[PDB]
Design a protein around this motif. Structure first.
Motif, mmCIF file in Angstrom:
data_model
loop_
_atom_site.group_PDB
_atom_site.id
_atom_site.type_symbol
_atom_site.label_atom_id
_atom_site.label_comp_id
_atom_site.label_asym_id
_atom_site.label_seq_id
_atom_site.Cartn_x
_atom_site.Cartn_y
_atom_site.Cartn_z
ATOM 1 N N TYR A 1 0.845 -1.186 0.000
ATOM 2 C CA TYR A 1 0.000 0.000 0.000
ATOM 3 C C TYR A 1 0.882 1.239 0.000
ATOM 4 O O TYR A 1 1.752 1.386 0.865
ATOM 5 C CB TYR A 1 -0.933 0.005 1.209
ATOM 6 C CG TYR A 1 -1.905 -1.149 1.238
ATOM 7 C CD1 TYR A 1 -2.939 -1.235 0.319
ATOM 8 C CD2 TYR A 1 -1.785 -2.156 2.184
ATOM 9 C CE1 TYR A 1 -3.827 -2.289 0.343
ATOM 10 C CE2 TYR A 1 -2.667 -3.213 2.215
ATOM 11 C CZ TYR A 1 -3.686 -3.274 1.294
ATOM 12 O OH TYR A 1 -4.568 -4.327 1.322
ATOM 13 N N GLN B 1 1.424 4.760 0.976
ATOM 14 C CA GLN B 1 0.862 5.584 2.035
ATOM 15 C C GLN B 1 0.944 7.075 1.737
ATOM 16 O O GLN B 1 0.847 7.888 2.663
ATOM 17 C CB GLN B 1 1.551 5.280 3.366
ATOM 18 C CG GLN B 1 1.214 3.916 3.936
ATOM 19 C CD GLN B 1 -0.244 3.796 4.326
ATOM 20 O OE1 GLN B 1 -0.855 4.759 4.783
ATOM 21 N NE2 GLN B 1 -0.807 2.610 4.148
ATOM 22 N N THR C 1 -0.552 -3.753 6.940
ATOM 23 C CA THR C 1 -0.941 -2.641 7.799
ATOM 24 C C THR C 1 -1.230 -1.405 6.958
ATOM 25 O O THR C 1 -0.411 -1.001 6.127
ATOM 26 C CB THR C 1 0.161 -2.343 8.812
ATOM 27 O OG1 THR C 1 0.573 -3.561 9.441
ATOM 28 C CG2 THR C 1 -0.344 -1.389 9.871
ATOM 29 N N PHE C 2 -2.400 -0.806 7.169
ATOM 30 C CA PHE C 2 -2.875 0.287 6.326
ATOM 31 C C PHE C 2 -3.324 1.443 7.203
ATOM 32 O O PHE C 2 -4.190 1.268 8.061
ATOM 33 C CB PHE C 2 -4.023 -0.184 5.431
ATOM 34 C CG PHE C 2 -4.448 0.819 4.404
ATOM 35 C CD1 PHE C 2 -3.733 0.975 3.232
ATOM 36 C CD2 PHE C 2 -5.568 1.599 4.606
ATOM 37 C CE1 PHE C 2 -4.127 1.895 2.285
ATOM 38 C CE2 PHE C 2 -5.963 2.520 3.663
ATOM 39 C CZ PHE C 2 -5.243 2.668 2.502
ATOM 40 N N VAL C 3 -2.762 2.623 6.977
ATOM 41 C CA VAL C 3 -3.140 3.821 7.717
ATOM 42 C C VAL C 3 -4.117 4.612 6.860
ATOM 43 O O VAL C 3 -3.761 5.079 5.772
ATOM 44 C CB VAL C 3 -1.913 4.666 8.084
ATOM 45 C CG1 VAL C 3 -2.326 5.865 8.915
ATOM 46 C CG2 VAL C 3 -0.898 3.821 8.832
ATOM 47 N N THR C 4 -5.347 4.764 7.343
ATOM 48 C CA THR C 4 -6.404 5.419 6.590
ATOM 49 C C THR C 4 -6.972 6.582 7.389
ATOM 50 O O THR C 4 -6.879 6.627 8.618
ATOM 51 C CB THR C 4 -7.527 4.438 6.230
ATOM 52 O OG1 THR C 4 -8.506 5.105 5.426
ATOM 53 C CG2 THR C 4 -8.194 3.904 7.486
ATOM 54 N N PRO D 1 -0.522 10.462 1.078
ATOM 55 C CA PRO D 1 -1.884 10.931 1.357
ATOM 56 C C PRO D 1 -2.610 11.359 0.090
ATOM 57 O O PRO D 1 -2.009 11.869 -0.857
ATOM 58 C CB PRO D 1 -1.670 12.119 2.304
ATOM 59 C CG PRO D 1 -0.272 11.997 2.800
ATOM 60 C CD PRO D 1 0.505 11.257 1.767
#
Lengths: 50, 67
Positions: free
Chosen positions: B29, B31, B64-67, B33
């Protein structure tokens, strides 16, 4: 952080846990008995006895 | 021949007994923004949904995905 899954473990199969020793772990009657709480009887001492 | 792996990485490749056990289900993914990652869908065209009903769609976050 011990979270690396690329190394080989050394535990295989099953372990003799307390859950597999159901037939070997008994229930214990220690012989102790839980009485009920007693009251106070005092009225008889404040009455004319004959 | 796995000789290219040491040249590119400096270490020998790690083959584990189940081939593909360590392979993630997603390549990765980005990341940065402002980007949108979509679920697995068959056709991204319009359709009218039923009102007053919750629509549940699977989303596989394979890393692991930061949304």
């Amino acid at each position: 952080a011990l979270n690396n899954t690329t190394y080989q473990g050394s535990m295989r199969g099953y372990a003799v846990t307390k859950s597999r020793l159901d037939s070997f772990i008994p229930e214990v009657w220690t012989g102790e008995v839980l009485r009920a709480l007693n009251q106070n009887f005092v009225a008889s001492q404040y009455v004319k006895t004959l | 021949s796995i000789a290219w792996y040491r040249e590119l990485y400096g270490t020998e490749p790690n083959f584990n007994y189940p081939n593909g056990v360590l392979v993630p289900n997603h390549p990765g993914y980005n990341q940065t923004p402002g980007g949108i990652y979509l679920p697995n869908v068959a056709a991204l065209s319009g359709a009218a949904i039923t009102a007053n009903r919750i629509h549940y769609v699977y989303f596989q976050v394979a890393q692991t995905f930061v949304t």
